Structure formats: C-alpha cells, structure tokens
Write a protein that binds this ligand. Structure first.
Ligand SMILES: N[C@@H](CCC(=O)O)C(=O)O
Lengths: 419, 150, 132, 193, 49
C-alpha cells in the first residue's frame, strides 16, 4: 500500500461490498495478542493505476488472481541472509507474482526474474524552492553596449562638427563647446535641465533633427522596461550527488542536513558507492514519505532522496506549489518498475508479450493521463504584481556613487592645477 | 556484430591513407577509442557493389568495448548492407515471409549480437531475445524554427 | 487595482529618492560655491519634477558633470515609474473559469471547492450513471 | 504608444502540440511530414487505425535514411519530422536551426538484440544492470550526449541589436549634408540682402 | 502656465516669482505627470478595436 499505483480502501459503510472497477484485497493482521492465534482475516478493496495494469494483463493472459498484502516488510532488504517482504513472499513459494512499485536492481533480478519495465524510475533530490534575486545593472539591459558606445560617439561627432561649423559660419557669449554638449544632453534626456538656446537657422535646423532622434530614442527605450526590471534568475542549491556539499559534509559552515527512508533500493545504492555520505545520512533517517515531506517543508531538512516518479507525482499534486525536484526532472540510475515472477517460470514470456502489446496499443498514455497527471506540473503562471524593491534601484544609485567620486577627484584635481 | 549509422551513437569516418584511424584527442583530455569497420561503399550496394574498411566509434562502440573487456570475448564488427533497421516483409506474392535489414542479417546467422539503437516492441521481441534497456527514450517531432521577423 | 497612486513604488524607495534630491542639491551648492544656493535647490527640484522653474544652471565644471548625470537619474526614475503604473493598470484578470466537465478540479473534489444541484432530478441521474 | 505595441508581444503561440492535433487528423498537401521507411515508428504508425488515413499521407513519401530526412528539412523542404527523442534532441543541440516540439509518446528504450537462446544473452543483462548503477552510463551520457552548444530560449523579454540603430544613425547623419547647403544658401541670401 | 504643464509641455511660458507659487506649481506638475501616465497606458488598444 503506497502512492496511487495501488491504494486500499476500507469496507463500504453500509453496502458491505466494493464499488465498480474495484477488486477485493485480503489483509492479515498478526499484531494482536499472541494468546491463542488471530490470522487477522480482513477484506478491503484495492484500486489504482497498477491494478488497472494487472487487470489489462489478466484480461488477455487468461487467468484469475487473488490479492494479498504483505505484513513482513516494505519492499525487502537482505538482513542476515533471509529476504523478507514482497521479495521474501515471492521467493518463499507462498505466492507467485508481485505487482506494484517493485524496482529492478541487480540483486532482486539475480534472485527473481523480472519482466520488462512499464514506467521510469530513478534517484532525484527534491528541495524547497528558494528565492531568487534580480540581476543588478539591469537598467542597461534593453540595449547593447555596442549601441551605447555608438550613441556616445555619434553624439560627440555630430554635436562637435555640425553645431561648431553652424555657429562659426552663420552670423550672450559666443557658442562654446560646453553649451553644445549641455544642450544636446538635455534634449536626449527627456528634458528640463535649463539650457540657453543658440541663434542661427542652421543650428535650429540641426537641433530639430536631434530632438526628433531624442524622442525616437526614448520611446523605444521605455517600451518594456517593466519586464526587464522584474525577471529574476533562480539558482540550484547543488548540482547533484557528486559535489563536495553531498560527498564531504565535514568541512561545511552550518551543516547541510539530508537523509532518506532506510531499508530500500536507494539506501543500498548509496551505501555501496558513497560511504561518508551514507554515514552522515544515518543521523537524519526519516520514517515515512509524509513525515519527511512535512519535516522538509517546516525547515528541519533541505534535501530528500527517493524514487523519481513518486516524488514527481507529489510535486505535481501538491497543495499550492512549495517544493520542486532538483534538476527539473533529473534521474540518477534510471531504472524501471516491473512484475516479479518465480524463478524458472513459463508465464514470463506471455506477460512480457502482453505488456509490449499494451505499449503498442497506446492504452498506457490514457492510463497515465488518468492516474499520473498533476496540477502544479504545469509551468509557473505569469509573474505580475511587482514591488520595485531597493535592489534594482540601488543598481542605478551606484551610478550616482561613481559620479560623486568622480566629482570629488576632479575638484581636487582642478584645485591642484590652479596652483 | 552488425551496427547501423546513427547521428549521435555511431560515427563513420574514412580511415587515413596508411590504414589506421587518425588519432584525435577529445576535450576532456582522453584519447578517443575507435574501431575499424568493413562497410559498403559511398552510396549503396546497387551500382558500387563493394565493401571498404572504414572507421567506427561512438557510444555503442564504447559500450561494446566495455562488455568485451568485462566478459572477455572478441568481435569483428561490420555494417549492414541493407541499411534498414528491420521489418518483416510478409507479401503473399512469393508465398514467403521474412525479415529484412539488421534483423534479417541477425536471424540468418550472419551476426551474433546487435549493438545499435534497436528499439523494443512486440513483433521484434517475438522472434529474438531483448536484454534490459540501455537508455530510455520516446517519440517526438522536429520542425524548423520560425525566427519571427515581424 | 489598488485605490492609490503611490502603489508602484515601495516606501523606502520614496524615502531614498526624497533624501537624494536634498543630498545632491547640497553637494552641488557647496561645489559651485567653494570652487546661487536657493537657485541650485530649485534647479535640483525642478529637474526632477520636470516643472519649468529654475533660473540658471551652475557654472562649475564638476557641478556640471554632477548635474548632467543627476538629470538622467531623475529621468530614469520617472520613466520606470510611468512604466510600472501602466503595467498594473492593464492585463490583470483570471484566464477563465472552470471549462470542461472532466476538469481535474471536479475529478478530485476537495472541501474548499463546493458544488451541488437539485435532488431528485435528471441531472443527478445522469450524474450517477457516469461511473468514471 | 503604437511603436511599442509592435515592438513587444508578437510571436506564434506554439507549434503543433499533440499527436491527435486536427492538422495531422486531416492531412493536406500544404503541411508535409514524413519519417524513415522500414522502421518501428512506421509500424506503430500503421497500427493506429483511427489515423489510418494519415498513414496514407505517410505512405506518400518515405525517405531512405534519417540523414537524408534531416538534410531535406534543413533546406526548407520538409516541415515536420517524427523520430526518436534522443536523436532529435542531439540534432537540435548540435544543429542549431531546428527545434523539437511535442510531448513524448510510445516510449520504448534501446535494447541489445540477440539470438533465441544463448548464455551471452543471460549474462549481458546482468552486466548492463551492474554497469548502469555504477556511474558508467551517466558518465558515457555526459561525455557523448552532453555538448550544449547553443544557449536557450529562456524568456520572452528579448534585448535589442544593431537593427534599427543603424537606421536612426543614418537619419541623424543625413542632416548635416542639407545643413551645409542651407548655410550656403543663407550666405547667398545675406549677400543679396 | 497650467495648461502647458498638464499637456506634457514645451509651449513657451514665463515662470512666476514667490515661494508659494512655485510650491503650488510643483504639486500641479506632480498631478500633470500622474495624469499623463494613466492616460497613455492602453491608448493603442482603444485606437484599434
Ligand atoms: N522503490 C523502492 C522503495 C522506495 C525507495 O527506496 O526510494 C524499492 O523497491 O526498493
């Protein structure tokens, strides 16, 4: 009993049966008093994506099936040499097939024959989405440094040559180049810096074209500034289970904590390769997917390692959108689920052929759309309602800082040059 | 072993004038490993019906070398003449049905293994055995970018 | 849409832009004098308010350099302010209501989203025949 | 107001999205698409009876190899090419003029073929299962599949280039050649008055 | 004076003298810049439909 591949519902309140599109499962409880005996004979009803797969299989391979729940272990690990759980139930001849979320690794495949995979699975870290800052100096973004220096040199050249020859050729003090640079800056800047206008028809003719260029420049400039002053670039916490942050947690400012659920495939896979990582993970071992999810949400944890498919499903079908998987759909040691069959059997070929026929029929896409779609799986909605914080504007304040520094140095420069 | 040309998996570059592949280093700094093939001519076996030694390398070749090292066997790789992935021609004209291409070459006893991007489905798995997937994938569509010049 | 005109900008931004005009005015006055004061203050206020007040410009060199970039700073501020207030005054509404009968909200009904019909009627009969 | 309106928010919504999209349902002669003949995609494409008519269009033109198909779609000949995810992804990464669009369907990986009965068929499976959780496959994928030549199409806000800047620069520079003429005519008029 | 400031500007005008007049002109210019940024928010949409 796990994620909605398979789910168990109790008996009907008054009907005493189970509804349509449902198969009855048996559950045996042995957690009562050991006085005489109690084989916990309870009947519930199973339903899910995986039971639909089992139905589609058994509706073409032509057999009948009883269902039964394991009460020994979650999935099964090798403890002292005796496999206990679903794999143990299959190898102990008490059953024949094992359907559900069983993963295909080396050991179980060596001890039990596996069918072809029907879904993808792998290791993926899921973390809470962190806040992202805005790129400073964004005020210069809806432009190019090329066109910046082009405007600089264009202004300099046209102002100097055109207005100088226009004032010198055609008949308040004389027209200094300082007035020339001051006038042309104000017009481009939108205006109001008080300035004294020249005299002469050619100068005014040139000023008219410059004002036209200025009004052109500032209408293109202010076309999408709000979009460029809002977009922020997010950052990934860690690249994956290969950086120093995961492999070597000893030399770290306040320690990054991460862990997983023990007694599983990912636990053995991590213990085989990464020794120190598993040694550090031993302290923060969780005791369930829901408890670990809530502990990661509250802030007691910052990285969770589990199967990729169920984590993706939980990230998609979550209340609101709080956390996300790292790498945006990355999978390490990409394996698949399957169906366990007893060693040296004959139903394996028929089961594989039926699964491949179901693949070639396209029903898998419909079943996935029916049982695997999520709400938050869609891309994030349009970002609106901004506040225009101090970051993007201090990015511009830095210009006033540099300008004040330049003014301070030029003041003492002129003071020393005067002497 | 029979392989087929594929853009990301197997490359086929002509060998040097001496007879050995031009050793070229990669970006990571490791020497690229290449194998010499015995592939057909430039276009097809139709007009230029003649085989020529070429150079082969890539992801499937690296996996093949890893397997040959880990289980200690030898191989003589050669391309497929038909150049088709495989299909079961069951036309009732000749009263016979048989596979063509790579699967036709494999079933006829020419080769023993197929190291290539061979997919998995019902019809092909009916006749031959399929190992565990070595890369997961799907089917998608490829178009040209519009490059809006509005 | 909020009922105000100071919404597109944070309060601390308003305080900073209110202090900056005074700081630049004092700096301009001091630099132009020790190398006209009230005139410099009106100039620094009018270049930002875009109003036509302000008699003359400073004659000092570094003062001119500082005013040249102060004018551009004020214009960038005004441009950004104008750009953001239109952005919240247009294109702000929900995309659409529930559309399909098979919409995932009705597929998985929660306690927050409530819906019902009239009992003992044909819609309920056809609504109880859809086993899916 | 109008010049900003044509300088933002102007692009097609999206390319073909679904496999059951009405364009593929009713195939016309203007919209062309094909695949590689004698391959699994065509077999699965001829088993979907609900799109049998579409297969007729697929039966119109089938290329000999995938390289010929990419060369055809390269030179503005074919509009859409249906192929595998990995090959098309690597082609869009290397060849930076094409884009893969759509959701995946009929997902089936690549497996090493072999004979009906063989001991090699028995232990190559265990060998690949051992070599896939030992970091070998991820390293091979990072070495031979992960090049990442181009950048991405991250967001809608796009910067500006020297496209209209040259035009406005020419418009500005044009003024002086008429200003000198007007100055000459002004001297001429001052001489006459 | 007050017409030009609201209209975006440049109609040449002669500025008054006195602190109170300039104080009032500042608030009027603030109202003018307010008025003309709301006004030009969606004019393209209203000039097309
Ligand atoms: N699917 C895993 C259990 C969950 C996990 O370890 O992430 C297994 O069968 O061992």
């Amino acid at each position: 009993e796990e994620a909605p591949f398979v789910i168990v519902e109790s008996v009907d309140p008054l009907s005493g049966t189970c509804m349509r599109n449902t198969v009855p499962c048996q559950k045996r409880i042995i957690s009562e008093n050991k006085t005489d005996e109690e084989p916990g004979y309870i009947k519930k009803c199973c339903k899910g994506f995986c039971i639909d797969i089992l139905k589609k299989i058994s509706k073409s391979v032509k057999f009948t099936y009883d269902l039964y729940l394991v009460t020994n272990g979650k999935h099964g690990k090798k403890i002292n040499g005796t496999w206990n759980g679903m794999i143990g139930e299959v190898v102990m001849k008490r059953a024949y097939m094992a359907v559900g979320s069983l993963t295909i690794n080396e050991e179980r495949s060596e001890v039990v024959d596996f069918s072809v995979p029907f879904i993808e699975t792998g290791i993926s870290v899921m973390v809470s989405r962190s806040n992202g800052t805005v790129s400073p100096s964004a005020f210069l973004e809806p432009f190019s440094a090329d066109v910046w220096v082009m405007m600089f040199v264009m202004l300099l050249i046209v102002s100097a040559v055109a207005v100088f020859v226009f004032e010198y050729f055609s008949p308040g003090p004389s027209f200094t180049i300082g007035k020339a640079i001051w006038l042309l800056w104000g017009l481009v800047f939108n205006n109001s810096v008080p300035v004294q206008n020249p005299k002469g028809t050619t100068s005014k003719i040139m000023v008219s074209v410059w004002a036209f260029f200025a009004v052109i420049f500032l209408a293109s400039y202010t076309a999408n500034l709000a979009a460029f002053m809002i977009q922020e670039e997010y950052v990934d916490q860690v690249s994956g289970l290969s950086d120093k942050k995961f492999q070597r947690p000893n030399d770290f400012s306040p320690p990054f904590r991460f862990g997983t659920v023990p007694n599983g495939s990912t636990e053995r896979n991590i213990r085989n390769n990464y020794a120190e990582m598993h040694a550090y993970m031993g302290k923060f071992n969780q005791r369930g997917v829901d408890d670990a999810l809530l502990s990661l949400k509250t802030g007691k944890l910052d990285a969770f390692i589990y199967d990729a498919a169920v984590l993706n499903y939980m990230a998609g079908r979550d209340e609101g959108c709080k956390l996300v998987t790292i790498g945006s759909g990355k999978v390490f040691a990409s394996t698949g689920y399957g169906i366990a069959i007893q060693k040296d059997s004959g139903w394996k070929r028929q089961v594989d052929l039926a699964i491949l026929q179901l693949f070639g029929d396209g029903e898998m896409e419909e079943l996935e759309a029916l049982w695997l779609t999520g709400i938050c799986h869609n891309e994030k909605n349009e970002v609106m309602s901004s506040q225009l914080d101090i970051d993007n504007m201090a990015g511009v304040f830095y210009m006033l800082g540099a300008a004040m520094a330049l003014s301070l140095i030029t003041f003492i420069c002129e003071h020393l040059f005067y002497w | 072993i029979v392989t087929i040309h594929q853009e990301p998996f197997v490359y086929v570059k002509p060998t040097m004038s001496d007879g050995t592949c031009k050793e070229e280093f990669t970006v990571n700094g490791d020497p690229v490993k290449k194998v010499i093939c015995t592939g057909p001519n430039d276009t097809s076996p139709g007009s230029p019906r003649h085989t020529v030694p070429q150079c082969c390398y890539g992801f499937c070749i690296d996996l093949l070398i890893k397997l040959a090292r880990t289980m200690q066997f030898t191989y003589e790789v050669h391309l497929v003449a038909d150049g088709k992935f495989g299909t079961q021609e069951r036309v009732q004209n000749s009263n016979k049905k048989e596979w063509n291409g790579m699967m036709g070459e494999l079933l006829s006893g020419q080769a023993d293994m197929i190291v290539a991007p061979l997919t998995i489905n019902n019809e092909r798995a009916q006749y031959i055995e399929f190992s565990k997937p070595f890369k997961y994938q799907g089917l998608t569509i490829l178009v040209k970018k519009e490059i809006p010049r509005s | 849409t909020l009922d105000s005109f100071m919404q597109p900008f944070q309060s601390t931004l308003w305080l900073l832009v209110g202090l900056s005009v005074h700081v630049v005015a004092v700096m301009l006055y001091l630099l132009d004098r020790f190398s006209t004061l009230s005139s410099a203050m009106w100039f620094s206020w009018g270049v930002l308010l875009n109003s036509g007040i302000g008699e003359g410009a400073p004659r000092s060199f570094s003062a001119r350099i500082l005013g040249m970039v102060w004018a551009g700073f004020a214009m960038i501020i005004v441009a950004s302010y104008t750009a953001n207030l239109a952005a919240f005054l247009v294109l702000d509404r929900p995309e659409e209501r529930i559309t399909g009968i098979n919409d995932p909200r009705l597929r998985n009904p929660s306690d927050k989203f409530i819906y019902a019909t009239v009992k003992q009627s044909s819609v309920d009969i056809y609504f109880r025949r859809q086993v899916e | 107001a109008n010049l900003a309106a044509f300088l933002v928010l102007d692009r097609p919504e999206e390319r073909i999205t679904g496999i059951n999209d009405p364009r593929l349902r009713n195939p016309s002669d203007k919209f062309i698409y094909a695949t590689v003949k004698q391959s699994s995609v065509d077999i699965y494409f001829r088993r979907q009876v609900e799109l049998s008519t579409m297969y007729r269009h697929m039966e119109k033109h089938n290329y000999e190899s995938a390289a010929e198909a990419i060369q055809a779609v390269r030179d503005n000949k074919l509009h859409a090419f249906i192929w595998d995810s990995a090959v098309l992804e690597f082609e869009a990464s290397q060849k930076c003029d094409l884009v893969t669009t759509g959701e995946l369907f009929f997902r089936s990986g690549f497996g090493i073929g072999m004979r009906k009965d063989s001991p090699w068929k028995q232990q190559v499976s265990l060998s690949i299962l051992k070599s896939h959780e030992n970091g070998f496959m991820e390293d091979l994928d990072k070495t031979w599949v992960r090049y990442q030549e181009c950048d991405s199409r991250s967001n809608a806000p796009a910067t500006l280039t020297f496209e209209n800047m040259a035009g406005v620069f020419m418009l500005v520079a044009g003024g002086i050649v008429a200003g000198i003429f007007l100055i000459f005519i002004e001297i001429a008029y001052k001489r006459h008055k």
